Every structure is written in structure tokens, then in C-alpha cells.
Design a protein around this ligand. Structure first.
Ligand SMILES: CNc1nc2c(ncn2C)c(=O)[nH]1
Length: 154
């Protein structure tokens, strides 16, 4: 039993946009932009909507890059995260009460201040690879076990 989420990386040839989450799940970490998919909404439409809500950016073309399932031991619901990439956006990043977006050069990605799984799958994202992953966490800082494989079809 899993709940759908989206995650969007605005990845340009020389930088990536991340947002410092100020509240809720993952507050205090840099992350891509995303959230829960709504009833009657497609996953891609949810990804576009969340990118706007959290970053202020409008995306047209979204590319599927991965699917990652997160398990937190002691929590019944799995997070089924559909990851997307875009290099084509409109607008300028907006800081709000919920999120502080900032651009990072690719060699300065702040892995120590990101979810630990990102250290595994971001290198694949940066090399334009697609993937399926599963990360089992104990709390929010420890990966107990994981699987990650490259795929041709997300
Ligand atoms: C659990 N791992 C994970 N969670 C995320 C991420 N970004 C937002 N949230 C809530 C991420 O990259 N990994």
C-alpha cells in the first residue's frame, strides 16, 4: 500500500535548482519540488502543479527520470515517488513561507543537507540516467537498506 508523490528537478547543463523546506516533512533539507498527487489528477499534472506551488516556476515539458519507493520502519504507508526532470522553465524562483529555492552548481550539490538517498540517485540523474529505487529508512537520517537500478523505461 503506497501513496503517490512527485519530485521535480530543474536541471540545467551547469546547475540545479533545489529548495530549502521550511515546514513539515523534510524541513531543514534541500530538496527537489513536489508533493502529493490529488484525486482525478495525473502524476505529471501533479508534478507541474507542485513545482509552481513550491518554487513559483512554470514547467511545460517534464521528463520522467525515476521511481523511488520510500519505507519508514514503523509507518504503514510507503511513499511512491515519481521523479521528473526539466531544463525548460518560465518564471523566476520564488521564496515563500514554505520554501527557499536556490541554484547550485553541479559540483556544489549540498548532499550533507539533503535526504541521504539523494547521494545514491542524484549521480544517475546528473548523467541523464533513469532509475527505479527502494530505500528503507529508520527515522529520517538512517538508510537501513536499499536497492537502486538503472532502467530504460521508468
Ligand atoms: C525519504 N527521502 C526523500 N524524501 C524527500 C526527498 N525530497 C523531498 N522529500 C520529502 C528526497 O529526495 N528523498
Amino acid at each position: 500500500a503506497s501513496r503517490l508523490y512527485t519530485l521535480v528537478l530543474v536541471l540545467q547543463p551547469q546547475r540545479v535548482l533545489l529548495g530549502m523546506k521550511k515546514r513539515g516533512f523534510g524541513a531543514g533539507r534541500w530538496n527537489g519540488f513536489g508533493g502529493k498527487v490529488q484525486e482525478g489528477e495525473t502524476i505529471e499534472d501533479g508534478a507541474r502543479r507542485e513545482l509552481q506551488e513550491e518554487s513559483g516556476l512554470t514547467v511545460d515539458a517534464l521528463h520522467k527520470v525515476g521511481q523511488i519507493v520510500f519505507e519508514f520502519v514503523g509507518e504503514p504507508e510507503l511513499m511512491d515517488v515519481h521523479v521528473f526532470c526539466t531544463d525548460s522553465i518560465q518564471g523566476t524562483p520564488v521564496e515563500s513561507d514554505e520554501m527557499r529555492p536556490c541554484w547550485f552548481q553541479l559540483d556544489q550539490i549540498p548532499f550533507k543537507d539533503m535526504w541521504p538517498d539523494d547521494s545514491y540517485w542524484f549521480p544517475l540523474l546528473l548523467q541523464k540516467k533513469k532509475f527505479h529505487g527502494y530505500f528503507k529508512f529508520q527515522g529520517q537520517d538512517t538508510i537501513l537498506d536499499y536497492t537502486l537500478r538503472e532502467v530504460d523505461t521508468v
